[PDB]
Amino acid sequence: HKGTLYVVATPLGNLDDMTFRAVNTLRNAGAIACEDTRRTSILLKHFGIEGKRLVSYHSFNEERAVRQVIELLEEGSDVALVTDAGTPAISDPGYTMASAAHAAGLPVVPVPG
Amino acid sequence: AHKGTLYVVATPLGNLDDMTFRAVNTLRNAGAIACEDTRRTSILLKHFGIEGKRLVSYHSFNEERAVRQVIELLEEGSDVALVTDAGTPAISDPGYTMASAAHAAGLPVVPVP
């Protein structure tokens, strides 16, 4: 049984405009992949979600972040990929990570927000 | 030799008139509009009275052709607007391949809020 890569947008302004579905993907993740650890930590703290491993997906270390996320998915854990607040949110590194999961045949599920 | 910009424009399913002027004007004056859902995009354009626009329609099997068309237009100094759905993350939209290709080509990719 494989984990799912959930792709989750963060709202601008009030974090209570997230959905329960979206926050559930964070609670249920083996790790949270993100491009802004500070904003991600603030988001987790807002919802009382403690102890989550954060995986940075910056360009330089992208290959390493991809390996880390693939390993978790293949081990059966979901991973949440959190994009910086904004809509639309541009992230080439994020896309690269989702692409890698899809190429490996792993489920990639966007979460409505 | 001035590079065109790929503008990524998020569009809602309803209440289209709540889109910003900036976003509608971007679509109105774009050199071409790239979209994965041509039917939905035509409905949007008709709504705002945007007539005669060149559309680049993205399909998996013909991914290359849509990407090539967009990159060629950007290299020729024309802006292109990629429409995506407002409610899901842009990096999940299959059409994001066109934004990642523009980035790979050193072309500007700009979100329109």
Q: Identify which of B88, B103, B113 has the shortest CB distance to residue A112.
A: B88
- C-alpha of A35 from chain center: 9
Q: Which residue of B has its CA nearest to A8?
A: B89
Distance CA A7, CA A3 (A): 13
Rg (CA), chain A: 13
Domains, chain B, ordered by start: 1-113 (3.40.1010.10)
Residues of B in contact with A108 (CB under 8 A): 92
- What residue spans of B1-113 are helical by DSSP H? 21-29, 38-47, 63-75, 96-104
Q: Identify which of B10, B100, B103 has the shortest CB distance to residue A88.
A: B10
Which technique was the structure solved with, according to the deposited record?
X-ray
Mutation target among A18, A82, A95 for the B interface, most CBs of B within 10 A: A95
Instruction: Please give the resolution of this entry in Å, rounded to 1 decimal.
Output: 1.9
B contact residues 65-104, partner A, Cβ 8 Å cutoff:
84, 86-92, 96, 99-100, 103
Task: Check B10 against A113: CB less than 8 A apart.
Answer: no
Nearest alpha-carbon partner for B93 in A12, A112, A100, A13: A112
Residues of B in contact with A95 (CB under 8 A): 91, 96, 99-100
- Please name every residue paired with B33 in a beta bridge, in sequence order, or none if there are none: B55, B81
Terminal Cα-to-Cα distance of chain A (whole angstroms): 27
Complete edge-to-edge strand list for the sheet that includes strand B80-85? B55-57, B33-35, B80-85, B6-11, B109-112
Distance CA B29, CA B19 (A): 16
CA distances to A5, A20, A71, B88 from B27, rounded to whole Å, are: 32, 33, 41, 19
- The CB density around residue A102, as the number of other CB atoms within 10 Å, is 12
Beta strands in chain A (DSSP E): 5-9, 29-34, 54-56, 78-83, 108-111
Residues of B in contact with A91 (CB under 8 A): 91
Mutation target among B91, B97, B98 for the A interface, most CBs of A within 10 A: B91
* Burial (Cβ within 10 Å: 0-12, 13-18, ≥19) of residue B103: middle
CB pairs under 8 A between A and B: 58
Q: Tabulate helix, strand, coil % of chain A (nearest 5).
A: 40, 20, 40
Backbone angles phi, psi at A89, to 5 degrees: -110, 120
- C-alpha of A26 from chain center: 8
Distance CA B35, CA B8 (A): 10
Taking the Cβ of residue B106 and every Cβ of chain A, the question of whether any pair is shorter than 8 Å is answered with no
